[model samples]
Target: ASRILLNNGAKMPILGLGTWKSPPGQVTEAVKVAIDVGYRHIDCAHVYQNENEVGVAIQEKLREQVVKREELFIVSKLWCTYHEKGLVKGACQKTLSDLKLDYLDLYLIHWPTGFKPGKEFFPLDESGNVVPSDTNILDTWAAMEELVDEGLVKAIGISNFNHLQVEMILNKPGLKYKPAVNQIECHPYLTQEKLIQYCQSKGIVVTAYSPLGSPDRPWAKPEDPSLLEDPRIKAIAAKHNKTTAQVLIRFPMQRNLVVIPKSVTPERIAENFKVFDFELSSQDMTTLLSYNRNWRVCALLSCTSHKDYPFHEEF
Candidate 1:
């Protein structure tokens, strides 16, 4: 698989396997196959509830010496509840325990909005709304930076943050570190050209999640536009003699954006890993990018009403 260097001198594979909806029951094998197919980067989140299994598969690879600890890049996220300075370190420690790893290669704050710190994964009111925390994201970042000093993580990053939010962190008073990357929901439908360029200009690497447009997303409507069924993309796939999924996965990489498209199926995992063998032509890239409708599959609708909700601003 192709790889890129982060601002902190960390080598992150450009393509990764996202484990968002991967179940604990099935993900261990999914992770096993992903490593077998040369996937050095594995994206996980505490909210996903499958890191222990993710760890088990990684253990096999390490035990067999298929890849050494130095050869793999493991990423895990800080859930919103850990945003308070006091809770951050414990949150990271729990993830490390669950992943059965000594340290993380990349650690990301999962979202801009903070959650009420407590035992519940999502502390909620009887009104079926999230209980918001007053904690500042910068405060949380400050604590995450300590993880690096403690050698608990190699690089720190953000996910689901908007441009202004990123700017706040970049210009933070007495800031000790620059974010190595900003992972976002991006695909051909939501090309995010300007946002991608903005982060790039700041020396921040960009990673695109939901790159295949997340057809399997639980709330998907029957009439929702399926990126896989788009005629223009299908035509491009036929032109290159590749499947539409490969075209979608390769589309993000064409413009140097890291992409993670998830799958629990072994065949799909192997197929997604085959993109390193070919490159999409520039003209084809332009045609595919022209399909951008600014669509986003992971819009974070549940938290859109929060004060720190990030999507209202234009990229």
Candidate 2:
């Protein structure tokens, strides 16, 4: 597996298993199978609510000596509720306990903004209103830096954040750490070239989620176009003797961005992990890059009303 060195000198796998919607009962088996099949990195989050199952798999792998903890990289996110300084450490500890691990390879602020705990999705009241909690991201970010100080997490970063939010955190005084990564939605339809470039300029590693455009996303509308079926992608896949999914994953890797493509099916998991076997030509790369329509699958509609909503402007 290829790897990208973070600014902190940590090596992260270029590809990882995304467990966002991987159901509870099956996610554990999926993680074990993915590890068995040679996946060295696993991307997870608190909102996914499957850490317990994923933990079981991690422990099983350890017990069976399938792989040592150091050989595998685990990534999880800090949710909205945990953005508060008082709640951040507990949240990190809770996920660490759930994963049955002593530390996380990486921990991310799940969103740039926060809200009171116990809300279903966002816009706490569901009336499309922003309560404007006293806890802002910079406050949460300072707490994140403390996670590293306390040795709970090896590295800390943010996810689903835009330029301004990133700038705000970077501009804070007395920051002991800079964000190591910024995980965001990236695919053929939503290439995010500018954002990726900006992150690179700031010495922050960028990870692409929904790299295959999330065709199997459970909540996606029925009429949604399949990225795997996009003509340009299919054409490039044919030339490289790879699937459209492989082409999607290869594009980001070629650009030096880490990618996490989720899959629970045995065959699909194996296929998604085989991206390293092929390479895309420069022309094919340009063709794939041309398909960026700024498409996004995970729209945080609930957070739009907030003063700090990240995607209010053009991509």
Candidate 3:
């Protein structure tokens, strides 16, 4: 797998296996297969509720000598529930303990909005509305910087952040470290060219999550447009003798952004990793870029009312 250097001098694999929505019993096998297929980057999150299983596969691979700990790039995100400054270390340590790793290669603030600290992942009120915590993202980020100083996490970054939110971090007073990456939902339907370019120009690497438009996302409606079934993408795939998925995954690679596509199926996992051999032509790239309609797959609608909600911005 190829790698990209972060602003903080960390090298991250350009391609990674995303672990969101991966069931516990199935993710261990999925991760094992991913490792077997030459995938060095594995993306995980506490909210995903499968870090223990991801750890099992990682530990198994290490025990079998398939790969050393240092050879792999593992990433995990801080859940909204644990975004308070005082709780950040406990959240990271829990993930570290579950993954059975001493330190993480990359750790990210899952979202700009902070959920009320509680046992429920989504703390709901009597009316079934999400409860928001008052903890500012800057305070959460300050705690994140401490993880680096403590040597618990090699590098830190932001996820699901818009350019304005990213600018807040960059412009913070007494900033200790710059964000190495900004992970966002990106695909042909949501090209996010401005946000990507803004982050890149500010020295933050951009990571594309849900690169295939995340068709498997739970909240998707039947009437929603499907990127996989689009005629233009199918035609391009046919011309290139590749699957639409391959083309989708390759789109971000050509733009110099890291892409993480999740799959629990072995064949799809292997097929997704086969993207490095071929390249999308400039015309193909432009055609894909032109499909942008600002449609997002992972819209965090529940948090739309939060002060830190990122989607309201034009970028």
Question: Over the full model, what C-alpha lDDT does candidate 1 score relative to the true structure?
Answer: 0.90
Order of models, best lDDT first:
3, 1, 2
Candidate 1 TM-score versus the reference: 0.98
- Candidate 2 weakest lDDT stretch, 10 residues: 117-126
lDDT by residue for model 3 (99-143), tens: 999999999999888999989998888877679998988899999
* Candidates 2 and 3 compared by lDDT, better number: 3
For candidate 1, give the lDDT of residue 300.
62
Q: Provide the lDDT at 204 for model 3.
A: 92
Runs in model 3 lying further than 4 Å from the true structure: none
How would you encode candidate 2's per-residue C-alpha lDDT over 1-315 as one tens digit per residue? 489999788999999999988999899999999999999899998889999999999999989999999889999999876677898999999899999999999999998778776554343565666555568788899999999988898899999889877888789887779999999998878888888888899999999999987876777887887898788778888888888888888899998999999988888889998988887888877777887777788875656777767798654
Give the Cα-based TM-score of candidate 3 against the true structure.
Answer: 0.98
Over 191-265, each residue of candidate 1 has an lDDT whose tens digit, in order, gives 898889999999999999998888889889999999999998898899889999999999898888899999999
Query: Lowest lDDT 10-mer window, candidate 1?
Result: 298-307
Estimate every model's Cα lDDT from 0 to 1. Answer: 0.90, 0.86, 0.93
Clashes, model 2: 0
Which candidate, 1 or 2, would have the higher lDDT against the true structure?
A: 1
